[PDB]
Amino acid sequence: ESADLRALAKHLYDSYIKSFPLTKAKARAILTGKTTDKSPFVIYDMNSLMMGEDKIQEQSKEVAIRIFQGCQFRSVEAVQEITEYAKSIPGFVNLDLNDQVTLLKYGVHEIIYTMLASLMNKDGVLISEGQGFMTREFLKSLRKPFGDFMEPKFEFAVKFNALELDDSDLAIFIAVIILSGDRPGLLNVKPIEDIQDNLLQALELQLKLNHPESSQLFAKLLQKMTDLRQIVTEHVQLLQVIKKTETDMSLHP
């Protein structure tokens, strides 16, 4: 029944609302300018960044490295909200505990980049819960290894954003990502694929009802799942350059 698939969609969208306080709808309002009153502080160079550093870690290092560190910090926060949203996907908590941990270990990065896109435009990204805005041009200008980190996330966002997904579409897409039966080291693949097949069904009906005029959006959306694997693999390999060739250490356990 469609009605069951709609109620699952609805239930996913409500859990997503709780887990993630800065939604696409809210961020697009800030990127554009709905109800303009609390316009975020813009960080467009080294000067404005420090202006905005002691406007709100604290100064004691090279700026590229503190920005990079700040992203480590923020992405450990985001793993906690993602972990919470996962618990609400039907069937997920009744899976083997170790496979639960394995799905999250490998899912979380792909989910963080999908969600960052809601915070990005072609020119910069919302930071500190929509309070700052950092320009892509400034991120691009940082010294060489650090200059190339965010740029591939911006390229993906721009292409993903022209799909015009909303939060209720993304609530299901996020769940399909978590429940991927091909991650290394999963004990029971079959129960995970049975869950994902039900979420695939609900995703498909969601897009058909919400975007009747985008032909084959379901399929273009699945195909974005290869682009995401590649951003993750690129980003993981860029962490290797850091680990080897750098002097600063302060990382989240």
* Interaction between residue 28 and its own copies (CB under 8 A): yes
Residue 109 is assigned to a ligand binding site: yes
* Interaction between residue 30 and ligand DRD (CB under 6 A): no
CB closer to its own copies, 61 vs 208: 61
* Interaction between residue 253 and its own copies (CB under 8 A): yes
Residue 73 is assigned to a ligand binding site: yes
Which among ligand DRD, its own copies, none contacts residue 16 (Cβ within 5 to 8 A by kind)? none
Answer for which of 6, 28, 74, 211 binds ligand DRD (CB under 6 A) is: 74
Task: Please list every residue from 226 through 245 that binds its own copies, using CB under 8 A.
Answer: 243-245
**Three-state secondary structure of the chain:** CHHHHHHHHHHHHHHHHHHCCCCHHHHHHHHCCCCCCCCCEEECCHHHHHHCCCCCCCCCCCHHHHHHHHHHHHHHHHHHHHHHHHHCCCCCCCCCHHHHHHHHHHHHHHHHHHHHHCCECCCEEEECCCCEEEEHHHHHHCCHHHHCCCHHHHHHHHHHHCCCCCHHHHHHHHHHHHCCCCCCCCCCHHHHHHHHHHHHHHHHHHHHHHCCCCCCHHHHHHHHHHHHHHHHHHHHHHHHHHHHHCCCCCCCC
CB closer to ligand DRD, 121 vs 196: 121
Task: Please list every residue from 7 through 26 that binds ligand DRD, using CB under 6 A.
Answer: none
Task: Please list every residue from 155 through 174 that binds its own copies, using CB under 8 A.
Answer: 162
* Interaction between residue 123 and its own copies (CB under 8 A): no
Answer for which of 25, 46, 93, 189 binds its own copies (CB under 8 A) is: 93
Residues of this chain that interact with its own copies (CB under 8 A) are: 1, 4, 10, 14, 17-18, 28, 32-34, 57, 60-62, 73, 76-77, 80, 83-84, 87-88, 90-94, 97, 100-101, 143-144, 162, 191, 194-195, 198, 243-250, 253
